[PDB]
Amino acid sequence: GSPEFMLIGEKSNPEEEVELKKLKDLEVSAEKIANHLQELNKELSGIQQGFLAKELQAEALCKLDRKVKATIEQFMKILEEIDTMVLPEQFKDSRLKRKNLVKKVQVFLAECDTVEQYICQETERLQSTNLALAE
């Protein structure tokens, strides 16, 4: 039939679900941060259509990307938080959930950084000016 041996008990996945529930919330909180970007992105793009000169436009973008940077940091906390998490090799689903989340974090931080970097790089190129090294 189907030989089974491990402990001889089985009592549902109570705590397993609890640990998993928190993990679930983490992805959502992440989903919310990611959602805020798309929301802010929509309003920014709308405003981006035109309103002020390049001076303010470039000014808004640099400020825009930097704020984007703050969003990336939140994503960083997700990885760092999970990174400093403790869990044995028993929670297969919970662990699989965390690992997949880690990569979500990698893309979320990076995707967010690219947007901020692009907006920054575009504005950055627009302004170069000179420099002076003395002290």
Task: Give descriptors for this structure.
135 residues; mainly alpha; Methane Monooxygenase Hydroxylase, Chain G, domain 1; 3 helices; elongated; BAG family molecular chaperone regulator 1
Overview of this protein structure:
This protein has one domain (1-135): Up-down Bundle (Methane Monooxygenase Hydroxylase, Chain G, domain 1), CATH 1.20.58. It is mostly helical and 135 residues long. The protein starts with 13 loop residues before the first helix and ends in a 9-residue tail after the last helix. 74% of the residues lie in helices and 0% in strands.
> Which term fits the overall shape?
elongated
Termini distance? 80 Å
CATH class: Mainly Alpha
Give me the Rg, rounded: 22 Å
Structural class: mainly alpha
**Mind summarizing the main beta sheet?**
none
CATH superfamily: BAG domain
Strand content: under 5%
Helix content: over 70%
Q: Supply the CATH architecture.
A: Up-down Bundle
Organism: Mus musculus
Protein name: BAG family molecular chaperone regulator 1
Short description:
This protein is 74% helix and 0% strand.
Question: What is this structure's SSE topology?
Answer:
Elements lengths: L13 H35 L5 H30 L8 H35 L9
Helix pairs in contact: 1-2, 1-3, 2-3
